[PDB]
Design a protein around this motif. Structure first.
Motif, PDB file in Angstrom:
ATOM      1  N   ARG A  58      34.372  28.996  48.158  1.00  0.00           N
ATOM      2  CA  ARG A  58      34.749  29.421  46.761  1.00  0.00           C
ATOM      3  C   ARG A  58      34.811  31.032  47.047  1.00  0.00           C
ATOM      4  O   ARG A  58      34.776  31.414  47.982  1.00  0.00           O
ATOM      5  CB  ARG A  58      33.442  29.228  45.867  1.00  0.00           C
ATOM      6  CG  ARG A  58      33.351  27.973  45.415  1.00  0.00           C
ATOM      7  CD  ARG A  58      34.300  27.293  44.476  1.00  0.00           C
ATOM      8  NE  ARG A  58      33.879  25.937  44.022  1.00  0.00           N
ATOM      9  CZ  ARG A  58      34.687  25.247  43.269  1.00  0.00           C
ATOM     10  NH1 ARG A  58      35.996  25.410  42.881  1.00  0.00           N
ATOM     11  NH2 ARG A  58      34.364  24.040  42.504  1.00  0.00           N
ATOM     12  N   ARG A  94      22.486  34.066  52.969  1.00  0.00           N
ATOM     13  CA  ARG A  94      22.909  33.468  51.370  1.00  0.00           C
ATOM     14  C   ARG A  94      23.077  34.499  50.592  1.00  0.00           C
ATOM     15  O   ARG A  94      22.498  35.706  50.537  1.00  0.00           O
ATOM     16  CB  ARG A  94      21.582  32.753  51.045  1.00  0.00           C
ATOM     17  CG  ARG A  94      21.505  31.288  52.053  1.00  0.00           C
ATOM     18  CD  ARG A  94      22.439  30.332  52.194  1.00  0.00           C
ATOM     19  NE  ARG A  94      22.258  29.203  53.076  1.00  0.00           N
ATOM     20  CZ  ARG A  94      22.337  29.266  54.171  1.00  0.00           C
ATOM     21  NH1 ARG A  94      22.694  30.135  55.133  1.00  0.00           N
ATOM     22  NH2 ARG A  94      21.844  28.012  55.027  1.00  0.00           N
ATOM     23  N   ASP A 128      36.677  33.017  41.867  1.00  0.00           N
ATOM     24  CA  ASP A 128      35.925  31.992  41.220  1.00  0.00           C
ATOM     25  C   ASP A 128      34.607  32.288  40.667  1.00  0.00           C
ATOM     26  O   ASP A 128      34.197  31.554  39.534  1.00  0.00           O
ATOM     27  CB  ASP A 128      35.782  31.064  42.463  1.00  0.00           C
ATOM     28  CG  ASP A 128      36.979  30.144  42.919  1.00  0.00           C
ATOM     29  OD1 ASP A 128      38.052  30.117  42.228  1.00  0.00           O
ATOM     30  OD2 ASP A 128      36.954  29.739  44.097  1.00  0.00           O
ATOM     31  N   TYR A 129      33.843  33.409  41.082  1.00  0.00           N
ATOM     32  CA  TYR A 129      32.481  33.713  40.324  1.00  0.00           C
ATOM     33  C   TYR A 129      32.550  34.838  39.625  1.00  0.00           C
ATOM     34  O   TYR A 129      31.591  35.206  38.832  1.00  0.00           O
ATOM     35  CB  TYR A 129      31.413  33.930  41.452  1.00  0.00           C
ATOM     36  CG  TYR A 129      31.193  32.646  42.452  1.00  0.00           C
ATOM     37  CD1 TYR A 129      30.467  31.639  42.140  1.00  0.00           C
ATOM     38  CD2 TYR A 129      31.778  32.491  43.846  1.00  0.00           C
ATOM     39  CE1 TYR A 129      30.141  30.498  42.631  1.00  0.00           C
ATOM     40  CE2 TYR A 129      31.152  31.526  44.724  1.00  0.00           C
ATOM     41  CZ  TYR A 129      30.436  30.477  44.128  1.00  0.00           C
ATOM     42  OH  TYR A 129      30.275  29.204  44.861  1.00  0.00           O
ATOM     43  N   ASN A 130      33.768  35.398  39.109  1.00  0.00           N
ATOM     44  CA  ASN A 130      34.113  36.537  38.397  1.00  0.00           C
ATOM     45  C   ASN A 130      33.523  37.731  38.836  1.00  0.00           C
ATOM     46  O   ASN A 130      33.132  38.572  38.267  1.00  0.00           O
ATOM     47  CB  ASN A 130      33.984  36.129  36.852  1.00  0.00           C
ATOM     48  CG  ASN A 130      34.647  37.184  35.943  1.00  0.00           C
ATOM     49  OD1 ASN A 130      35.739  37.627  35.992  1.00  0.00           O
ATOM     50  ND2 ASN A 130      33.601  38.011  35.230  1.00  0.00           N
ATOM     51  N   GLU A 161      28.852  29.527  47.432  1.00  0.00           N
ATOM     52  CA  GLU A 161      29.485  28.309  48.151  1.00  0.00           C
ATOM     53  C   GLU A 161      30.338  29.133  49.096  1.00  0.00           C
ATOM     54  O   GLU A 161      31.146  29.517  48.439  1.00  0.00           O
ATOM     55  CB  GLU A 161      29.873  27.291  47.612  1.00  0.00           C
ATOM     56  CG  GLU A 161      28.944  26.645  46.614  1.00  0.00           C
ATOM     57  CD  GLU A 161      27.772  25.614  47.009  1.00  0.00           C
ATOM     58  OE1 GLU A 161      27.417  25.751  47.994  1.00  0.00           O
ATOM     59  OE2 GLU A 161      27.119  25.070  46.153  1.00  0.00           O
ATOM     60  N   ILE A 206      24.244  35.868  46.508  1.00  0.00           N
ATOM     61  CA  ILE A 206      23.676  35.604  45.319  1.00  0.00           C
ATOM     62  C   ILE A 206      24.788  36.393  44.310  1.00  0.00           C
ATOM     63  O   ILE A 206      24.604  37.518  44.603  1.00  0.00           O
ATOM     64  CB  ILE A 206      22.178  35.663  45.175  1.00  0.00           C
ATOM     65  CG1 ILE A 206      21.417  34.979  46.230  1.00  0.00           C
ATOM     66  CG2 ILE A 206      21.817  35.451  43.745  1.00  0.00           C
ATOM     67  CD1 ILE A 206      20.045  35.703  46.871  1.00  0.00           C
ATOM     68  N   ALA A 236      24.685  36.344  39.691  1.00  0.00           N
ATOM     69  CA  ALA A 236      24.063  36.142  38.637  1.00  0.00           C
ATOM     70  C   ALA A 236      23.076  35.106  38.928  1.00  0.00           C
ATOM     71  O   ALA A 236      22.948  33.836  38.023  1.00  0.00           O
ATOM     72  CB  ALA A 236      25.464  35.554  37.738  1.00  0.00           C
ATOM     73  N   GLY A 237      22.343  35.265  39.441  1.00  0.00           N
ATOM     74  CA  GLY A 237      21.159  34.278  40.125  1.00  0.00           C
ATOM     75  C   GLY A 237      21.227  32.925  40.485  1.00  0.00           C
ATOM     76  O   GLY A 237      20.319  32.117  40.723  1.00  0.00           O
ATOM     77  N   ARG A 238      22.582  32.846  41.029  1.00  0.00           N
ATOM     78  CA  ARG A 238      22.955  31.500  41.770  1.00  0.00           C
ATOM     79  C   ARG A 238      23.578  31.988  43.230  1.00  0.00           C
ATOM     80  O   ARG A 238      24.174  32.896  43.227  1.00  0.00           O
ATOM     81  CB  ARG A 238      24.069  30.696  41.122  1.00  0.00           C
ATOM     82  CG  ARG A 238      24.262  31.059  39.495  1.00  0.00           C
ATOM     83  CD  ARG A 238      25.761  30.910  39.247  1.00  0.00           C
ATOM     84  NE  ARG A 238      26.522  32.228  39.397  1.00  0.00           N
ATOM     85  CZ  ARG A 238      27.654  32.272  38.975  1.00  0.00           C
ATOM     86  NH1 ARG A 238      28.410  31.401  38.343  1.00  0.00           N
ATOM     87  NH2 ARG A 238      28.194  33.414  39.363  1.00  0.00           N
ATOM     88  N   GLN A 239      23.040  30.955  44.021  1.00  0.00           N
ATOM     89  CA  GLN A 239      23.654  31.052  45.496  1.00  0.00           C
ATOM     90  C   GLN A 239      25.008  30.507  45.644  1.00  0.00           C
ATOM     91  O   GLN A 239      25.572  29.690  44.769  1.00  0.00           O
ATOM     92  CB  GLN A 239      22.828  30.238  46.325  1.00  0.00           C
ATOM     93  CG  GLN A 239      22.936  30.460  47.928  1.00  0.00           C
ATOM     94  CD  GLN A 239      21.882  29.568  48.530  1.00  0.00           C
ATOM     95  OE1 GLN A 239      22.259  28.447  49.360  1.00  0.00           O
ATOM     96  NE2 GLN A 239      20.614  29.834  48.410  1.00  0.00           N
TER      97      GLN A 239
END
Lengths: 76, 76, 76, 76
Positions: free
Chosen positions: B54, B42, B58-60, B51, B44, B46-49
């Motif tokens: 993506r 998994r 997409d997550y910068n 996907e 991570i 910015a504190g988010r899992q």
């Protein structure tokens, strides 16, 4: 007993828990305290994600252990 | 470009990536370097899992961003 | 002055703010208190999303106003 | 099935929906009923923003669930 639940973004949550509490139980406690839906919560100890059906004692989580918390969206 | 992947056990690895690499692509690069199957990873940011489908952009996620890696096992 | 920031999940945050504070400033205060990255925050007043470079006074937000906070996670 | 769509101004509508309906489909239904353009709609369930391409069943949105609706527009 007290455990600590730390985000990777700076936030610490203190929980009142038993050794016999499931991860499911702990996620419900986090929802109660923080409003975070259990389906969105991933709890981490010893560099691994914890499974819902297991207890704190199953992972050797004790008084004053730190868990980490990350958010999962998807269908949660 | 280089990105960093840090485990929750404090180990840092460097990866060679493109902004349009998928999370799936990044997991494959981790397997190449570390031998960890993508299904057990998994990622991570910015504190988010993150996907699978993506992109880094997409997550910068940029040059010399740090991602976190946790293991997601069944039975441990 | 004090304002309230409420999630849709029943969490309330109290902030010390000025009328001249921007939405951006408020987001930074939320990051300080909660660890929530500003990029992930959407602030809501009078049932609409607020814009970064506007002040509290620009939206007629005063002492003891309630804002809402929702997450928009970049990517997944 | 019946769902509620509730704005943060307390404006509540009911919709007739199927588990297989996309978020985009729901937005179109809101436009039909309430005159809100889909581009101005942000739909929220369990404090998270929903993705246009995903279904009600994908989020485990069931009989009598409330979605929250936040208006997004520049200039106010």
């Amino acid at each position: 007993m007290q455990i600590f639940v730390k985000t990777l973004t700076g936030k610490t949550i203190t929980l009142e828990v038993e050794p016999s509490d499931t991860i499911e139980n702990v996620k419900a406690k986090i929802q109660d305290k923080e409003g975070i839906p259990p389906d969105q919560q991933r709890l981490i100890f010893a560099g691994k994600q914890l499974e819902d059906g297991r207890t704190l004692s199953d992972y050797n989580i004790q008084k004053e252990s730190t868990l980490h918390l990350v958010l999962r969206l998807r269908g949660g």
